Structure 1
């Protein structure tokens, strides 16, 4: 499907991806957590607002990750969680480990 191809190619083509929408406290937390460590140029955020294929994309996210809700966060093409997991990983140090292993965060 168009949605499957869009999602698959976005996560394969970009090292850090977050699917998001405006009305989403966990999306805000997720983007903030990533931006704590990464320049915006290294974060690929796909917002569903204003799209006409939002439901199709979320349906495919259900197939791929086990849930429809945003946010859905991927590192190196792999699902790492939905809100508010990204914030937890940020706060317990594990997100930085993941980002370093993926080569988008240097040791400081």
Structure 2
């Protein structure tokens, strides 16, 4: 499977998502993630609402297989559940 992290290297959650995703890579095998930087690529608010839906959260957020997962707590749990039981 593929993962996408829309955060920056230093916006805690961002690093956390990265930590988590990076981790899975060595336990799931079919788990390749991509790093995306909200202030490098060019995202505002509308984008996120269109690509994720966005609750009234800020940054960062996670995407797995292109479907939206949420901000971070969600990815943590969601991952725990669907990837590491």
TM-score greater than 0.5 by the shorter chain: yes
Structure of greater Rg: 1
Specify which structure has the higher proportion of strand: 2
8 Å Cα contact 2:5/2:61 also seen in 1: yes
8 Å Cα contact 1:34/1:43 also seen in 2: yes
**Large movers: runs of 4+ above 3 Å:** none
8 Å Cα contact 1:30/1:84 also seen in 2: no
How many residues were matched structurally?
A: 79
Distance in 2 between residues matched to 1:43 and 1:35, nearest whole Å: 7
Of 46, 59, 64 in structure 2, the residue corresponding to residue 75 of structure 1 is 64
Shift of 1:86: 1.8
TM, length-normalised to structure 1: 0.56
8 Å Cα contact 2:61/2:70 also seen in 1: yes
CA deviation vs aligned residue, 1:55-91 (integer Å, no higher than 9, x gap): 2xx421122322262222122221122123222334x
Distance in 2 between residues matched to 1:47 and 1:35, nearest whole Å: 16
Of 33, 53, 65 in structure 1, the residue corresponding to residue 20 of structure 2 is 33
| Unmatched tracts of structure 2, length 5 or more | none
1:20 aligns with 2:7: yes
